[PDB]
Amino acid sequence: GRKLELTKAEKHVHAFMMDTQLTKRVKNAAANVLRETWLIYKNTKLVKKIDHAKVRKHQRKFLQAIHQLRSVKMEQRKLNDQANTLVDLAKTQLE
Amino acid sequence: AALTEEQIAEFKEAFSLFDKDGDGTITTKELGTVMRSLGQNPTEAELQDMINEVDADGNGTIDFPEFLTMMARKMKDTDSEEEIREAFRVFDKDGNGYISAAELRHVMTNLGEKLTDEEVDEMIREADIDGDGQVNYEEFVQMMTA
Numbered sequence: 001g002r003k004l005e006l007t008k009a010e011k012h013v014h015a016f017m018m019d020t021q022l023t024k025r026v027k028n029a030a031a032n033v034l035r036e037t038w039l040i041y042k043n044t045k046l047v048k049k050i051d052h053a054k055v056r057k058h059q060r061k062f063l064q065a066i067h068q069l070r071s072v073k074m075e076q077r078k079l080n081d082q083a084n085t086l087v088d089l090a091k092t093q094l095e
Numbered sequence: 096a097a098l099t100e101e102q103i104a105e106f107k108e109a110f111s112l113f114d115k116d117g118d119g120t121i122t123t124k125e126l127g128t129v130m131r132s133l134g135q136n137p138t139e140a141e142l143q144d145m146i147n148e149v150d151a152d153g154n155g156t157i158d159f160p161e162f163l164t165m166m167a168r169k170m171k172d173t174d175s176e177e178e179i180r181e182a183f184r185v186f187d188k189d190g191n192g193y194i195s196a197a198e199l200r201h202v203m204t205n206l207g208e209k210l211t212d213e214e215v216d217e218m219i220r221e222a223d224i225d226g227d228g229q230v231n232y233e234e235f236v237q238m239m240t241a
């Protein structure tokens with residue numbers, strides 16, 4: 001039968017955005033990545049006049065939004081392997 | 096997604112692993128019990144997401160129809176050769192690709208669920224391909240997954 005094989009994990013992280021708390025988190029954090037990337041770029045490349053405090057502030061909001069996205073993505077990976085655990089358990093009845 | 100009649104029947108037996116009280120539906124509470132019996136610790140929210148991903152009609156539980164529908168989309172398997180080799184590597188003390196027969200016996204008789212000393216002898220008989228008292232676990236894992 002399947003011997004040592006296990007359910008194959010999906011190509012790329014795609015799932016569980018039905019969660020609606022995860023989806024709100026992605027939407028807000030991603031928009032904040034867009035917001036702070038623009039604001040950091042403007043305050044370093046489109047000003048005559050680099051205001052380093054402005055840059056620190058948006059650097060802080062930037063890393064926060066980036067890591068929020070990371071955090072959602074890892075949570076989706078955890079949910080996917082939890083679901084594949086259940087699929088694997090049920091596939092033992094195929095033997 | 097094309098479940099044979101056979102797989103449909105044995106997935107019914109599979110439903111009972113999850114439906115702990117037999118009432119025809121799987122709840123978050125039953126999935127928590129199941130998941131913890133597999134040594135995992137999903138949070139309440141993670142259990143809700145498990146259910147909600149499969150619950151087609153939205154009544155909060157999974158019935159065999161929604162259960163089987165999900166199964167049909169996840170039948171593809173992949174080989175485990177490399178995950179297994181990494182489990183062996185946990186015991187590769189010097190990171191040289193080898194675990195001694197004596198160390199393998201130590202690990203297998205003291206950690207996890209354990210093997211009997213008679214069981215570890217049969218394991219090592221297969222694992223020490225070269226008879227040098229050392230287990231090249233990459234090669235051993237390749238022979239078991241061949």
Ligand SMILES: O=C1N=c2c(F)cccc2=C1NO
Nearest residue numbers: 083086087113145148149165
């Ligand atoms: O989300 C799921 N809930 C499941 C269940 F109870 C049994 C087998 C597979 C399951 C899932 N795969 O994604």
Ligand SMILES: [Ca+2]
Nearest residue numbers: 114116118120
């Ligand atoms: Ca039940």
Ligand SMILES: [Ca+2]
Nearest residue numbers: 150156157158
């Ligand atoms: Ca349902």
